[model samples]
Target chain A: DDFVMIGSPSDRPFKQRRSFADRCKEVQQIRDQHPSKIPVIIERYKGEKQLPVLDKTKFLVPDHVNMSELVKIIRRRLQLNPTQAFFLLVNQHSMVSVSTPIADIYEQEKDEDGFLYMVYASQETFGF
Target chain B: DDFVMIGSPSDRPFKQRRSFADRCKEVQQIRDQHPSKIPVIIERYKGEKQLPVLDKTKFLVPDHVNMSELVKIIRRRLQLNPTQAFFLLVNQHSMVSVSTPIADIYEQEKDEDGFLYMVYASQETF
Candidate 1:
């Protein structure tokens, strides 16, 4: 395989960057192969704005993929510092950690759109 | 004071977004106010290529900030999903966990740049 390219863009513009997150086919293939395939939609938000490109996509990742690997995909595609100061929020009190499974975050709280909306936030607003 | 706006463009382009990380004055103030102030340089990279903006600037965060909070700052500015797949590395077997301290990461491995160079990678390659 071509190594599901995400981040590491040498000098490509953001609009022209390749996305592994938008690889809907690969993600669905993995989801379908699993016995209890659970598909979820992830909407990316930058506070009040939405990021461009693959970030503009729903990020159709498999639940089987742990939060750590999920972060790896995002961090690469967005081209962020490996340990850049950032985290995900389901709401005011619910935040996603690196080890938590994606399936656990939306156990019974799938929004009306059937997708989990994730808001990007600063450490000042949310904490560990 | 205004939520240190990072992501959430609604319709505005990325270059127009306000940055909380680049507030060097504020970050330096906090770093200076602390007792054992440990200011470390966090270089952002997109594999071989580097991201733009505050990303181009090394993230000078303190040790007081935990791993979880650290991830939050980066994720927000980058506008990533809540459970996005990502992680950091001290290199090979030594990866920085959500609980690890930025100080410890540079304790012995401060690269020649005099800053801890952080390279972004997918779930796939290094």
Candidate 2:
């Protein structure tokens, strides 16, 4: 059982990337580098409720400062492996959107880009 | 001022059409074939509010039966010119969305398609 954390990419081409696998690897790499003292549970499941099984490969990454940095720190301390991570961002309209896919971890290195584009699936998920 | 009515193309590739100009022409043709006694106003404007001016050429057509036919009738009754018309459709989620643009009127004829794809802009407007 690999612990995969999801969050935004610090630097990249499109200011944001959204992929589940990428975030998973990120979390895992961070955790491996830095061990965490706290006990946390991170597991992968098929699907919940009516939502279809989000292929661990297609997980989205969030584009935001607070969440990106927060997830990065947790990954570094946890020594977890990136698997199926989900990143969420809140837009200017107060809408929560997915910024990057999980598979972006394998993306080729690129120049520094500003912020990533976020995708909003539903309004209900935004706590509206 | 030419009266322009916008509506869906009754028989065509897609189930519906939404271009404003197309509807305007359709209405005008219908009116010419069957004269209407009432007077209607149909003019083109650039923009409104903070929204960008939707080019009269890029007007979208809606893909719905009710609204499609409704606009069709109004066009037929009024001898309007196909210029700038707005077609809208309601989605299954009860959201109102824009269907077509105004310039699709000049599109070549095609086979019959069941329905047309609709674009949703904003929840408030929809």
Candidate 2 on B1-126: residue-level lDDT in tens? 997967445422222344556645655564465442111222222222322222222222332223334344333433323322222222222222112222231122211221122322222232
Off by over 4 Å in 1: A1-55, A94-98, A122-124, B1-126
Q: What's the DockQ for every one of the candidates?
A: 0.04, 0.02
Least accurate 10 contiguous residues by lDDT in model 2 chain B: B105-114
lDDT of 2 at A45: 16
Fnat across every predicted model, in order: 0.00, 0.00
How many residue pairs clash (N, CA or C atoms closer than 3 angstroms) in each of the candidate models, in the order given? 32, 57
Per-residue lDDT value at A84 in model 2? 20
Candidate 2 positional error at B100, Å: 13
Q: Of the native A-B interface contacts, what share survives in model 2?
A: 0.00
TM-scores, each model vs. reference: 0.36, 0.21
Query: What TM-score applies to chain A of candidate 2?
Result: 0.20
